[PDB]
Design a protein around this ligand. Structure first.
Ligand SMILES: N[C@@H](CC(=O)O)C(=O)O
Ligand SMILES: N[C@@H](CC(=O)O)C(=O)O
Ligand SMILES: N[C@@H](CC(=O)O)C(=O)O
Ligand SMILES: N[C@@H](CC(=O)O)C(=O)O
Lengths: 317, 314, 315
């Protein structure tokens, strides 16, 4: 039987109207026939309380586990609110082709029709599947396998809240039967340039929410708080309000990296549209979303604040 | 023929004065007696409350005219949803008000603006469009202003109504409705901006892991009367941010919880005790439309219970 | 300059117009490639037949075997573009790009979608990253894997989707980016070879519903069906009277392959239908019309239930 470690971080999956990893397994006992499972509690928080500190601890623990000859995969039980950020971070910091699966539940374990038991059963099946190797970090939810680059929570409450709006799920898992149909062609995991092994604190990156009659006072406050980067969640194709644009221009001139994303939810925040990024000193984040653009910019800033080098990062990963 | 006025405000649809915009689609003149009027000439990413008030008052004046059947507003796609939602609560008429734009400029291969404008005129004159509220007509679809959003950066099909769906269709000018909003709009709205020269300041914050208090603090220092929090998942804040929003709400700045996710309700009685923290739950909107509704709310009250009732009604 | 052949088959993209006229309407493509046009057929795609599929595939294989030729674009009606693209995806013995493109509005229409679609197709066909992506449909600034693509809407310019995956890439004013690729074998890796085939095996499709019938199964058998796709209720479920007739069809050696009418998801093995006891094949993650194409190709080499199940579980 393959050896898998489950790292528990908290989330609604571990809620009762907090449950232990052994008690989550004991609700899905069938799971133990698939794999020799070890559980380890890394954190016990709603994912809305996640920090860079916890991300670093998690990434370094995953790298330690996957470096072990006997350990075939890691599963991470997690809140659904920021699972896309944790998964994207790990996608760029896990130096292994071995499977890493994030899984949660939109309803607590106590709920009628709790989604967590089936999500966890399916997550184990994905984790031990030979075809999961070198797929990158995946989120497994509602019978779907999502590439961490592409995944997002797109609904506040639905069990089917996860989507990959720019590319779709890469595979399915239906009662443990695992099929892949696509794979990411953007570099991940072992092929990532990033290495967080010697990092204790990630660079501060703020996110701003664009709208009509917008302001410069939030750019100004992020700068005053020592932001090394700002993600602008722009209107349509990453467009700013003029007053805000002016403040972002000043921010970029001072060496704070300004990366343009969108509030809209899907699609690329493109280069060579309405914003002259070269003249203003900005990066276009292309086919991400504000919260995952933040993660990539935080990792970019561990080794450069050069606009060209950071545009190449966003145009690669 | 029915009289329709087209108010032009700018946007990629005009990437060109309204006479030459209207002249690109001569067929619209078979449908209606069309007058064009240039209200503004801006990218919708440059819109302000000043232009919204100008626009609403002009629409009201036109629709109060016996002979004016409908108003079409040509507009940038970026903030069309905010302008439509604002008009949906400030236009005191059941006559049709149709917003239309284009994701490609008129110069483009396969420009979408000509068909969109033709369809918009057909929606505006259709008898079934009366009392539907303000609508966005894009990509052969009719979306209720309450429900509509731009969901994609670039696609001609960027508009969606993720919590409902389109209320109707328009296909080479053939108009059909299948649903209608049951949320009050237009003539049934309590809001009246006829005497308002300036809208209350409302900020929007973008929630994430390892969040901050400094942007809440800056909105307060700038004299925000309202803050929309675009929360993680079902409107959840980071604790440091929640503490700052609690301070904001105690100071009499209205804090309304929405979500960054894109769809679904930011619900009451989930993980956030709104009653104890003094917050409003914005329910089935999105941050940018919740901002519009909070701006209108603040024109008559800053009371939490009264603003919760507004979000739970409109 | 890359050399590309555009093979015109008809469709509303050409709504009628000659190939050079279609080409002359988007002059920007001539800076991108040396373009040659060829008229293969001039029909709406609702009139497509296996005869045209074979002519097209053999001609695409001839062109792509030429050292001088970088890629082929096929202009096509939208209605059955997914069936032609899927057929070529399993019969084209090259890694060179093959792009299908059409238009939901004719060239004469307000806001005709054909010019941008064709311009974008030419950009996809010459892009270095399009090599070994398999046959693709390029529509509405999207690049769809032929295995996954379907027309999902009657009218909309955005009617194409890949409901089980999603687009593999984007093309926005000619800028080509891939984000994913299929992990199902295609083109040069496919076991199928139609080089000596003149007529494809007859495969019917049946539409399931409550109070269903055995008469259409029987008519297809009488007409010499070599296979039947059953577009079943939910997860490929038949009505009992229909199932009985399908069981008789399978016993007689006509291959019965279960798909679904619903639009998305897999018609799975080991659900409510005992395929092994009944002699059926589960088509898994396709749709009825693409399952028809794969069954027609399967039948050019075997009628064996296990061998055809392995084909559906591979391609
Ligand atoms: N707030 C919860 C929601 C969930 O897990 O569904 C969390 O993200 O931890
Ligand atoms: N930035 C433009 C985009 C468009 O109209 O499509 C606007 O909103 O004015
Ligand atoms: N019936 C046409 C429809 C189209 O091309 O859009 C065809 O498929 O040829
Ligand atoms: N085949 C079952 C499927 C279900 O209920 O989920 C039925 O329709 O009765």
């Amino acid at each position: 039987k393959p050896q898998v470690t489950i790292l528990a971080t908290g989330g609604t999956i571990a809620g009762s109207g907090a449950v232990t990893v052994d008690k989550l397994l004991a609700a899905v006992p069938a799971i133990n026939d698939l794999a020799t499972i070890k559980g380890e509690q890394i954190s016990s928080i709603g994912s809305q309380e996640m920090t860079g500190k916890v991300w670093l601890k998690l990434a370094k623990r995953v790298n330690e586990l996957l470096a072990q000859k006997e350990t075939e995969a890691v599963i991470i039980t997690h809140g659904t609110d920021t699972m896309e950020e944790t998964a994207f971070f790990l996608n760029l910091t896990v130096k292994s082709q071995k499977p890493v699966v994030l899984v949660g539940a939109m309803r607590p374990g106590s709920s009628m029709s709790a989604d967590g038991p089936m999500n966890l059963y399916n997550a184990v099946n994905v984790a031990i599947n030979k075809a999961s190797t070198n797929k990158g970090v995946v989120i497994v939810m509602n019978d779907e396998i999502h590439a961490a680059r592409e995944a997002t929570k797109l609904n506040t409450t639905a069990v089917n809240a996860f989507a990959s709006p720019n590319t779709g799920k890469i595979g399915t898992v239906y009662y443990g039967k695992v099929e892949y149909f696509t794979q990411s062609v953007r570099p991940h995991t072992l092929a990532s340039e990033f290495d967080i092994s010697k990092i204790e604190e990630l660079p501060r990156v703020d996110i701003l929410y664009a709208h009509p009659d917008d302001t410069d006072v939030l750019v100004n406050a992020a700068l005053q708080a020592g932001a090394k980067g700002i993600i602008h969640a722009g209107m349509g194709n990453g467009n700013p309000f003029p007053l805000t644009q002016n403040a972002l221009e000043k921010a970029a001139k001072s060496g704070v990296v300004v990366a343009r994303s969108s509030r809209v939810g899907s699609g690329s925040t493109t280069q060579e549209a309405e914003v002259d990024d070269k003249k203003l000193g900005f990066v276009a984040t292309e086919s991400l979303n504000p919260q995952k653009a933040r993660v990539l910019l935080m990792l970019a800033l561990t080794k450069t604040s050069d606009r060209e080098a950071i545009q190449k990062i966003f145009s690669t990963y």
